[PDB]
Every structure is written in C-alpha cells, then in structure tokens.
C-alpha cells in the first residue's frame, strides 16, 4: 500500500566526466551514473489514478533544465528589465543528452502501461520503477523533438480540451523527420528544414481525425499563430548551440489535407539563425556571436505537437494553431505516465 | 484583488482603430493570462480574447475576424488591445481581468479594471442645449428640472445650486436619439412655498465640448 | 458549444430574505463555473469560483453549490448592498443574468406633466416630458396622447436605479415632435399604468394656458 506523495527526485544519466560538452558536464556533477539493472515490477489487479496536469516530477524537471541553461548558456550580453551584463562569449559544444528521475528511500514511481491513457483518470496496467526512463530535455516550441512515441494511436492531451486558455499536446504514434541545416559557404543566417510532406500531410490527416472525436463532428481547421513573440509563432529550438526559428505555415496546410499537385514531396522551411533572443527562462533578452562557420545540421524526430484552439461559440468548425512557450508542457509530454507514491 | 488601470474615454469614428491599454504590474513565476471583454448598453458581458504577458501568446474570438490585437510593453506591466476597422456595434464598455495567482483557473477573474468607454459613432462633438421643466403652476411638493439635449459624446453632469442641493434630485440615464445624439433629463421636487423664495439652478457640465450651462429655472409666467 | 441557461432572469425579495438564482449547463462541465455580481455603473466582482469556493473578502451569506450539469448561486439574507445583477461564467460562456432588487410595498407613481419651453419652440423642436416619481414595482407603463390620439414611436424613456433608502424607481418620458407639428393639437397628456394605482392616471396641459 501507499499513498500519492510529492518528494526531493534525483536524476541519474549515461553522462561522460570527460567531454565538454554541456549537457554531459552538467549531468556529470548533477546527476548519478544510470542503474545498471533497472526492476520493473507489474503490479496485479491494481488500478490507479493518474493526472499529467499535476505532477510534481515536471516542476522538479524544469528546475534542472533551466540550471542546465543557466549555467551552460554563454552569451555576450544578457538584458534584464535594465541591468545589462557583458561577458565572454565562446561557442559551446551543444547537444541534449538522456536524463533519468529517480525516487530516494521509502518512494517509488507508479508508471502507468496502458497504450491509449491519455493523461488523466484511471490505469489499470500499473507497474512500479526506480527510475523514469532516459527524456531528453529538448527546449523547442510547435513541435516536441526526439521524444517517446506513443504506442497504439495518436492520442490527444489536455487538461481540459473545452478550455481555450490550455495547451494540447498531440502525441504521434509515428515519427516525422525534420533534417535543419544552414549549409556551408548566401546569408550566414539563413537555413532551411526539410520535412517529407507525403509522410507529414498523411499523419497530419490522422490527427485531424482524432480532433474531431473531441468535437462531435465539427470542421478541423489548422492555422498559423494569431501573434506573440517569434519563439511561439516560429518552430524555435537549438541545434549545435545556435538558435534556429522556422517558419512552419507550410506545415499546416489544410488543401493537403485532396490530390493537389505538390502536396507530395519534400517541404522546405525557411529558417533563421537569430543572436538576439528572449529566454525562455524567461529573464529577458540575450545576445549571442554569429554563428559558427561551415555546415550546420540537425536532424530530429518529430513525436508531439503542441497546439491552441481559438476561442469563441463556433458550431461549424474548431481551428487550431502551432503553440507551446510554456516549456513545462514539453516535460509533461514525457512525464505523463509517471506518479509517485509513498510507501505505507 | 487590486484593480487594474485602463486607459480613458475613446470616441472615434466608423473605420478607425482604437488602443486600450490596461496596467496590471508595478515595474517592481507563473504567469495568468490578461483577458479582455466588453459590454454593450444593456447586453451579456462578451469575452473577446486572452494575452500572455510572458511570450504575447494570444487567443482572439473567432468572429472577430482578426480585427483584435493584444500585445504588452517591454516590462510588462501594460498589456495593449486594439480594434480596428470600428463599426457602431463595437460601441461598448471594455473590460481587462485577470485570474488571482494563486488561483489556477485562468477564468475566474478576480482583478478587473475600471472599464474603458468606447464608443463608435459618425457623430461630432457638440455641447448640450438646456431647457428648463417649469414648475407647474398648479400647485405640498413640486417638481422642477432642466432637459439636457442634444449632445455628443457622453457624458454631462449635472449639479443643482452648485452641487448644495443633493437631496431630491434624481437625474436620468442619458438616452441616444436616433439623431445620433444623447438627451437626459434632471428632476428635482421641493416644497411648493419655496418656489416663490427659492432659487433653483441646474449646473451642467460637457467636457468633451468645453461647455458649461448654469440654467435657472422658474416657474413659467403667464 | 455548451450552453448556459440561468434563471430567473429577474426576482424580488424583503431585506433578510432567502434568494437563489441557478445555472443549467447543457452539458457535464464538472466545477467549472464561477459566479460575478455586477452593480449599475462598475465592473463585475468574482463571487465564486469552481462552483462551490467563496471567494475571499466576500460575506458569508453568498453561497455556491453545484455539479455536473445543475449549479446555484444563493443569498443567505438579502441585504441592501447586493442590489445587482448576477451572472454564472463557464469559460468564455456567460449565463444570461438576473436582475435582483429590494422588494417593498407597492407605491404609485407621483406624475408630473411639463410643457416644452418657449426657448426650445424657438429652435424648431417641442419637447414634452412626463415625470414618475418613487415608485414601486419598476413594472409601469406611460402612454402619450395628443388631442386623446395614442401615440408611439416618438417617445423615449429613462429610469434610475433603485434608491437605497426608500427601494423606490423613478421614470422620466419623453415625445419628441417638430414645432410645426405640436402647434397643430391642443391637448397634451401623459397617461401613466402602475399596479398601486387602481386606475390610470393622466396628467395633461392645454397649448398655451
Ligand atoms: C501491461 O503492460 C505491459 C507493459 O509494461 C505489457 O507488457 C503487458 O503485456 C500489459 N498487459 C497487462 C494488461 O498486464
Ligand atoms: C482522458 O480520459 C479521462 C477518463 O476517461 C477523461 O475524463 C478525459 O476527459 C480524457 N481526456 C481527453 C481530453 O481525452
Ligand atoms: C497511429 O494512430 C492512428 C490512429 O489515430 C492509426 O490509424 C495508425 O495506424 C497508427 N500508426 C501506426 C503505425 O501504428
Ligand atoms: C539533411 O539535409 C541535407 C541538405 O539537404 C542533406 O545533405 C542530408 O543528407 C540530410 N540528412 C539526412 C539524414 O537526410
Ligand atoms: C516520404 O514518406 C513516405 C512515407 O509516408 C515514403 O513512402 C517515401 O519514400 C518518403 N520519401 C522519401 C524517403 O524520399
Ligand atoms: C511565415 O511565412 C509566411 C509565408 O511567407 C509569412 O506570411 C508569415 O508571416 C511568416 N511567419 C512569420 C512569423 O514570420
Ligand atoms: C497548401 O497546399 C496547396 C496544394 O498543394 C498549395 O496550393 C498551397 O500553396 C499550400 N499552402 C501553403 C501556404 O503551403
Ligand atoms: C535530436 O536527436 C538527434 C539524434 O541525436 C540529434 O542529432 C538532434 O540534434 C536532436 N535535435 C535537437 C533539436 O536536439
Ligand atoms: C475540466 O476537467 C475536469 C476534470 O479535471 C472535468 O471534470 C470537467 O468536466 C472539465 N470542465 C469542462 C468540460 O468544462
Ligand atoms: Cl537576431
Ligand atoms: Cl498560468
Ligand atoms: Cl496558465
Ligand atoms: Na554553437
Ligand atoms: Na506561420
Ligand atoms: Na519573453
Ligand atoms: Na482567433
């Protein structure tokens, strides 16, 4: 027996003492090394109630992430709200590696097995865990890159999908490639993501599908961000320490979703590579050198998309908006099986 | 459950834009949203969209058709919603609101502003007239007061002797004619001995015209 | 694509006595409806939230209950302060409100007929007022007769608020007419229906006399 219960988590990681690269110095010092014969226990004729909306492990999530950017981030000059700070400024060596939550003595991790569990309510496939699996803490916006897939079929989260002001998280069963590169020497900035559209049109239809399931029957609508700064209204993530913003209205087109010519095919997007930014710490403004010389790429599996529903009665069709800018959401997507409990 | 501050009185014409800001912040870490609503002369309060101060992420009712904007200044302290291409029926009183912190329910609206008046009109600005409603004489009390017409935009106070005599008086929500005007109407009853002694004067007041009437009003000679 | 049906949409009651206005979701939204006042002139306050949670710095006589799909907001004693209208809000959805006042003894109308002004004749226009004064339910009906012709469409009205002390409503009626047009009649008269009056009463005057 036990009882739902928040405590202190500590994470564990595959993290290399020797490399400089900053993801691996930060889990070297912050985390323990992974265990090396993880016990998963399935619990019989258990059933247990689950709520990804609430969940402590994603507070304690973010706290790491945001001393991992702290402390790892070098730019030339941080402003916040009229303090400026200037600084050395060099290129960093930059890559997201597998981070592992794991309970102290006297805890332990429910994790929930049920294929198609959405977040929240009961599960009846109950096991318990030392540790949560390796989630990488991939910082992006619109799309949630290199992330678990879900098992069955697309699977539709949120705390309340008839509230406007929640985020949904749209977890794919399948996953999308998006190849980023600002090719070799045009503008420095420039840079462009590939994405086959004959693959992301298919799963973007399927999406649509399970929308409606939510909406009695209404018409799905997809549509670019309404506004806000370019970190939400772009595909805003960091590849190889620089800090990409795609331009992703070509993604959701919704004549993709009969045979148009040029719905097939590759997609391009254009990109830029921008120094100055807004933290999604949310500190204020950072300035960073130019980029790096030579190709730079990044390919990622696209797993989830975060979206916001407009608001306002409408009876014949709900229209949705690439989201996110709330980076707990992209932990939740990860963390939404997870419960901890304490043993009684 | 501070109120928050909203920009003053707009009046513009159909076609134009208009900008109301609302401060929510001193200058001096979960963020709710700032919404933004409205209400028209006797009608539902309309919620027409949201704002978050931490990104300018927004959500605009549908059937605005993109005509609403929400953006917040640099410190963000001060969220911003403009209207454009304004038509009559945008006439109302805006509303900002904001969910207390603590509370984790972006819609139950613990701080609101003052509201801010708009109004939508092909209209000019011109100052009241003022007429006086004599005092029948037709004889315990009688009412007296001065009929207000004619003016644009809202609103006008009214006085009686320079604000002295309060008790009695009753003035009356402006009405909009179809001339695209307003009118309303100030009463007050007083003894009848008094009529004969007494000296009553309605004080009106039009800022937006710069116009000012003190009208006597006397019971009518035959 | 939820809809909420408050009612009533309008009630009465003494000082002290027990009100209750109710909600009714057309689907299950489980506590997500909150509750405003809103008095005449300022903006709405938050009374409840999550259906059943009195918000704080509230009197303990404002009440919540609710779920599902049936919700109320209830008023322990009616007091003088909560004269107001009230309305339930489920996300971006409002109910249609109530309308909520002091209920006292019925009290007629004292009525008041005012010719226009030789000042306004002068400017082409003729305004005729017709003044109600402290009664008692709001619920009165005013009718313009010229030369005993019943006239409508070119009349406007205008009521106050319930005054706190006495409870009572005052109306204040206008018919607007060209000056050409009221020097054509004689006999102007403001014919007033009020439930404490046991028959209608008018006021009228006679064009210059
Ligand atoms: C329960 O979940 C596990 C995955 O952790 C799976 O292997 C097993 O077959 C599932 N079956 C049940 C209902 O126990
Ligand atoms: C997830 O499942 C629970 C229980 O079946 C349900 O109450 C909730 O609304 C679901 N969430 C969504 C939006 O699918
Ligand atoms: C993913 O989910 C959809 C249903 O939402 C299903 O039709 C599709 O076959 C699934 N894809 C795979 C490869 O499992
Ligand atoms: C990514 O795109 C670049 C430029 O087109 C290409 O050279 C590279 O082969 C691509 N990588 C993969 C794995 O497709
Ligand atoms: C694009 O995706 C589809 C799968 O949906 C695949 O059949 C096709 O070969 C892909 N195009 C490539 C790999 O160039
Ligand atoms: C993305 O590209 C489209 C097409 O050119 C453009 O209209 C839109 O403004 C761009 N989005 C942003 C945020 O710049
Ligand atoms: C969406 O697809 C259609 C059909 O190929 C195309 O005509 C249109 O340009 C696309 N929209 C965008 C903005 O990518
Ligand atoms: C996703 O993972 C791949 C494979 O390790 C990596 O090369 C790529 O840079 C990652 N993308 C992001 C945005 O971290
Ligand atoms: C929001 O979610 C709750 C559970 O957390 C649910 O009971 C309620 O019905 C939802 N509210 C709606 C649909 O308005
Ligand atoms: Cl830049
Ligand atoms: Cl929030
Ligand atoms: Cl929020
Ligand atoms: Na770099
Ligand atoms: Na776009
Ligand atoms: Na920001
Ligand atoms: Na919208």
């Given amino acids: ?344 | 459950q501070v109120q928050l501050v909203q920009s003053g009185a707009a009046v513009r014409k159909p076609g134009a834009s208009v900008t109301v800001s609302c401060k929510f912040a001193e200058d001096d870490a979960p963020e709710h949203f700032i919404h933004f609503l409205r209400q028209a002369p006797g009608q539902q309060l309309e919620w027409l969209a949201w704002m978050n101060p931490t990104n300018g992420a927004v959500n605009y009712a549908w059937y605005l058709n993109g005509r609403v904007t929400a953006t917040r200044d640099r410190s963000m302290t001060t969220a911003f919603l403009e209207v454009k291409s304004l038509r009559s029926d945008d006439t109302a009183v805006y509303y900002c609101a904001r969910a207390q912190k603590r509370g984790r329910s972006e819609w139950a609206y613990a701080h609101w502003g003052q509201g801010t008046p708009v109004v939508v009109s092909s209209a000019s600005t011109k100052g009241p007239s003022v007429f006086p409603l004599a005092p029948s004489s037709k004889s315990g009390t009688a009412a007296l007061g001065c009929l207000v017409k004619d003016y644009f935009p809202e609103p006008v106070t009214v006085s009686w002797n320079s604000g002295a005599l309060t008790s009695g008086v009753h003035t009356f929500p402006a009405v909009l004619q179809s001339s695209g005007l307003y009118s309303l109407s100030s009463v007050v009853t007083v003894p009848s001995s008094s009529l004969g002694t007494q000296t009553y004067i309605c004080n009106v007041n039009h800022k937006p015209s710069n116009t000012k009437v003190d009208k006597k009003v006397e019971p009518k000679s035959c | 694509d939820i809809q909420m049906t408050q009612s009533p949409s309008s009630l009465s009651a003494s000082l002290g006595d027990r009100v209750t206005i109710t909600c009714q979701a057309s689907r299950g939204i489980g506590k997500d409806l909150n509750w405003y006042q809103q008095k005449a002139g300022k903006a709405p306050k938050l009374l409840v939230s999550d259906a059943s949670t009195l918000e704080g710095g509230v009197p303990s006589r404002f009440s919540g209950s609710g779920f599902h799909q049936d919700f109320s907001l209830t008023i322990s004693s009616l007091q003088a302060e909560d004269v107001a209208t009230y309305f339930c809000q489920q996300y971006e959805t409002f109910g249609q409100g109530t309308k909520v006042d002091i209920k006292r003894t019925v009290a007629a109308p004292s009525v008041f007929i005012f010719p226009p002004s030789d000042e306004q004749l002068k400017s082409g226009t003729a305004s005729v007022v017709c003044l109600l004064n402290n009664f008692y339910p709001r619920e009165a009906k005013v009718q313009w007769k010229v030369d005993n012709a019943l006239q409508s469409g070119n009349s406007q009205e205008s009521v106050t608020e319930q005054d706190s002390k006495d409870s009572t409503y005052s109306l204040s009626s206008t018919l607007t007419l060209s000056k050409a047009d009221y020097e054509k009649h004689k006999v102007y008269a403001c014919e007033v229906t009020h439930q404490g009056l046991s028959s209608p009463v008018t006021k009228s005057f006679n064009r210059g006399e």
């Fill in chain 1, 1 to 344: 027996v036990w009882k739902d219960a928040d405590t202190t988590l500590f994470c564990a990681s595959d993290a290399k003492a020797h490399e400089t690269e900053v993801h691996n110095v930060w889990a070297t010092h912050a985390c323990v090394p992974t265990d090396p014969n993880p016990q998963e226990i399935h619990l019989e004729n258990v059933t247990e109630n689950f709520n990804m909306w609430k969940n402590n492990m994603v507070e304690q999530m973010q706290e790491d992430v945001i001393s991992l950017w702290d402390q790892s981030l070098q730019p030339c000059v941080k402003l916040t709200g009229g303090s400026v700070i200037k600084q050395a400024c060099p290129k960093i060596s930059f890559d997201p590696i597998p981070i592992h939550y794991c309970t102290p003595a006297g805890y332990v991790i429910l994790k929930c097995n049920d294929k198609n569990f959405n977040g929240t309510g009961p599960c009846k496939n109950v096991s318990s865990v030392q540790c949560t699996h390796g989630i990488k803490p991939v910082v992006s916006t619109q799309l949630l890159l290199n992330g678990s897939l879900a098992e069955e079929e697309i699977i539709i989260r949120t705390e309340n999908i008839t509230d406007n002001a929640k985020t949904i998280i749209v977890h794919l069963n399948k996953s999308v490639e998006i190849n980023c590169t600002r090719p070799s020497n045009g503008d420095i900035r420039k840079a462009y993501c590939e994405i086959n559209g004959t693959k992301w049109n298919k799963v973007l239809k399927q999406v649509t599908e399970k929308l409606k399931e939510h909406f009695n029957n209404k018409t799905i609508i997809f549509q670019p961000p309404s506004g806000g700064d370019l970190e939400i209204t772009m595909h805003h993530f960091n590849c190889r320490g620089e800090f990409f913003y795609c331009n992703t209205t070509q993604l959701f087109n919704n004549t993709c979703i009969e045979t148009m010519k040029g719905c097939n095919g590759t997609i391009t997007l254009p990109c830029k590579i921008k120094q100055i930014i807004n933290m999604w710490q949310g500190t204020g403004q950072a300035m960073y050198a130019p980029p790096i010389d030579g190709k730079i790429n990044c390919v990622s599996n696209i797993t989830g998309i975060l979206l916001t529903r407009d608001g306002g009665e409408n009876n014949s069709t709900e229209i949705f908006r690439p989201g996110g800018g709330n980076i707990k959401d992209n932990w939740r997507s990860e963390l939404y099986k997870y419960k901890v409990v304490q043993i009684e």
